[PDB]
């Protein structure tokens, strides 16, 4: 991207919750372009959340995402021989990209045999404030500021 | 019921043999079923441009065999004449399975 500024491409709203944020999560889940299988997995998850929870899955989904979004992160920058971990804000766009990516990654780290259970349970532990996803988010933010000494290298 | 098969390599050489057979028969036979297209059969030849190595160059060549149908119903004797010795194309081949 040396010329333009590659504009964010819009996604087709969910075929159920009619949410773009959902298609997104589905895309991350998807592997080898098997968007059907991807779709099913996510849905059985919204279902499993309906089960163990008397709350609309869509609301749980959101909440979860929100808790995994990193509002700060460290970025490497070479200055004077060595490389310094410079902490800096995180654009909204990237927070979303990061939150969803981590949810799926954290979810697939889980122990439950069935894919749907994993996303479901990860999504829950997420909106709760726990789970491997939220840790990554926290281990990152802890990383930032832990290097606030270099915050003047704004970047 | 005259089955007419026209094949070739030029799509003008054939359309110039489906015209010397479309009007020179609408004055002695049925209203005739216009020249019918018929999908082509392409044959690709992919060759490595250079004499030695360089297997990543390659150029593409092909032999496109166009087709035509016509099919004039009602031989009528008089039709089988306006179309006896009144053609022109040299890069064409004709067939008749009436």
């Amino acid at each position: 991207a040396r010329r333009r500024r590659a504009e964010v491409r819009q996604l087709q709203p969910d075929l159920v919750y009619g949410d773009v944020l959902v298609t997104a999560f589905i895309n991350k889940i998807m592997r080898d372009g098997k968007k059907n299988l991807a779709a099913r997995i996510f849905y059985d998850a919204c279902k499993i959340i309906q089960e163990k929870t008397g709350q609309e899955p869509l609301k749980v989904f959101k909440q979860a995402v929100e808790n995994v979004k990193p509002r700060m992160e460290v970025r490497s920058r070479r200055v004077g021989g060595a490389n310094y971990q410079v902490p800096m804000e995180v654009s909204p766009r990237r927070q979303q990209s990061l939150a969803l990516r981590w949810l799926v990654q954290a979810a697939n780290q889980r122990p439950e045999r069935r894919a749907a259970v994993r996303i479901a349970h990860e999504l829950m532990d997420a909106a709760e404030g726990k789970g491997g996803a939220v840790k990554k988010k926290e281990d990152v933010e802890r990383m930032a500021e832990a290097n606030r000494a270099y915050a003047h290298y704004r970047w | 019921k005259i089955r007419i098969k026209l094949r070739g390599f030029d799509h003008k050489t054939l359309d110039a043999s489906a015209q010397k057979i479309v009007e020179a028969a609408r004055r002695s036979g049925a209203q005739v079923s216009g020249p019918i297209p018929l999908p082509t059969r392409v044959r690709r030849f992919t060759v490595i441009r250079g004499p030695f190595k360089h297997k990543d160059s390659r150029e593409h060549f092909e032999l496109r065999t166009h087709n035509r149908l016509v099919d004039i119903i009602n031989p009528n004797r008089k039709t089988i004449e306006q179309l006896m010795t009144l053609d022109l194309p040299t890069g064409v081949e004709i067939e008749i399975k009436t």
């Binding site: - | 390599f9 030029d10 392409v42 044959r43 690709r44 030849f45 060759v47 490595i48 441009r49 004499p51 150029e59 593409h60 060549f61 092909e62 032999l63 496109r64 065999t65 890069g91």
Partner: protein, 60 residues
Amino acid sequence: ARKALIEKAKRTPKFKVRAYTRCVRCGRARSVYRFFGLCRICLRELAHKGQLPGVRKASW
């Protein structure tokens, strides 16, 4: 093409197996296209001259 191994025209292979295409123009024995009897090199040479009827440059 070693004008002596161009005994392919022999037709008396003892066993039809030993029969091998071989170029009609170069003697080139390794890329002889059945349809043209030519090798990939000459097949490209003549096609450029328009001496191979119908054969054009494909593109899509």
